Write a protein that binds this DNA or RNA. Structure first.
Ligand SMILES: [Mg+2]
Ligand SMILES: [Mg+2]
Length: 114
RNA sequence: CCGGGCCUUGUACACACCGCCCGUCACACCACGAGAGUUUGUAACACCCGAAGUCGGUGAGGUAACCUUUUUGGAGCCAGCC
């Protein structure tokens, strides 16, 4: 594990803010077609971060057209150019898996301003 | 017994009782009903969820007009939230 950290330190990334579960975040996710490269903004609430160092992943939930969507990303990708936090929600949890069963007015996170 | 004539009478008969005519069945057609159910539609009702929008309450964030010091603070407004 020390060797692991020493190896993976260079591919670790530092443009990340210290965001949490509960807080809304936009991901500038770039997708690749081979001929073009398009960034698209996936906004959503963060249900979980999990992992250590470079195995750290986080998921982001959205409700596009009445269909709950849930998109996991590794934290340290070159294919995610920016991670904009836009609300600092308050929760008493780390894993917000209760949000999968709710819809809308009950699935609302209480913003803090901090 | 048959036939004929005269009166009268009843009749749903009038090529006039060798008349008329009821009902079932067979055949063909038509329309309708009931029917295990199946399929559409309307209109409400009881709950759940709930867009936009008005209204109400908040608004430590943002804010050229107003008052203030002018060096900034306020009033008000807005985003946003409920
Ligand atoms: Mg006879
Ligand atoms: Mg019928």
């Amino acid at each position: 594990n020390p060797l692991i950290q020493e190896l993976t330190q260079e591919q670790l990334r530092t443009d990340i803010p210290a965001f949490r579960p509960g807080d809304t975040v936009r991901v500038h996710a770039k997708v690749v077609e081979g001929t073009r490269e398009r960034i698209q903004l996936f906004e959503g609430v963060v249900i979980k971060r999990r992992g250590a160092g470079i195995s750290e992943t986080y998921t982001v939930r959205k409700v596009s057209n009445g269909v709950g969507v849930e998109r996991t990303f590794p934290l340290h990708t070159p294919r995610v150019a920016q991670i904009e936090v836009v609300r600092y929600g308050k929760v008493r949890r780390a894993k917000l898996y209760y949000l999968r069963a709710l819809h809308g007015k009950a699935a609302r996170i209480k913003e803090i301003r901090r």
